[PDB]
Recover the amino acids of this structure.
């Protein structure tokens, strides 16, 4: 029995940009009220109960190569 | 039994951009009220119960390459 | 039994863009009330119960090559 | 010339109420822009431009009594 | 020329109430912009530009008696 | 010329209340911007520009009594 695993990667996940200033992020207020009486969370749980979340995201080259090379043998 | 696994990737997941400024994100307020009693979450749950979430997302190059090379053998 | 697996990729998942500014995102207020007595969630659940979510997305190159190379032998 | 002025009032402008109860006011706020270059207001101008106003007004007795007595002799 | 002025008032402008109870006021506040340039106002001008105003008014008796007696003689 | 001025008032502008109770005021505050370059206000100009105002007003007896007696003789 034999197994061979040689994934080759020569990829070039890259960016070019000019001037990037003058980004204004200016939230107002907000008011968040929560009760939570009897929660149970198990394994890979990703949870918000209450939220009032403000995001400015400006990567100037936001490129995302994503891979997975799962092999299984039984 | 012989297995030979050799993915190859030369990909140029890339961007070029000019001047990327003058972005204004100016969210107002918000009022979030939550009650939550007997919540039970398992295995892989991604959840929001009460949200008021604001996003400005300006990649300048939003390129995704997403892959999955799942091999299984019995 | 023998197996050979050689997926090649030479792609240019790419963008070019000029000046990319003058993006205004100005969410108002909003008001979210939630009660939840007896939620029960298992496996790959993606849930919003109450939400008031605002997105401005401006990728300058919003390309998404997406693949899957599932192989099985049983 | 004499002139006599003897107005009488006994107005029982009353109210009775029970319990002023479960009054909720929960506005999810809007979004406004105004661009008024030129405006020219003279005398009793009672004015609103680009308003987004929410009123709850819950008297235990809304009893206005308006009585604009006037006399002129020339 | 005599002139006799003797107004009389005995007004029970009264009120009665039970408990003033579970009054909740919960604004999720808005977003506003006002780019005015060259405004001009003279005398009793009563003015709002670009408002986003929230009111709960809950008097145990809003019993507004108003009695604007005027006399003018030449 | 005589002129006599003897206005009488006995107005019992009273109120009675039980418990002023569970009053909650919970604004999640908004966002405001103003750019007023030139303004020219003269005499009794009552003015607001770009307001975002939240009022809870809970008298146990809102009993206004306005009685603007006036006399002029020329």
């Amino acid at each position: 029995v034999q197994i061979v695993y040689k994934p080759v990667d020569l990829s070039k996940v890259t960016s070019k940009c000019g001037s990037l200033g003058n980004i204004h992020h200016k939230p107002g207020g907000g008011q968040v009220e929560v009760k939570s009486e009897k929660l149970d969370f198990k394994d890979r749980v990703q949870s918000k109960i209450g939220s009032l979340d403000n995001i400015t995201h400006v990567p100037g080259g936001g490129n995302k190569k994503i891979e997975t090379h799962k092999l299984t043998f039984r």
Notes: DSSP finds no helices and ten strands in chain A.
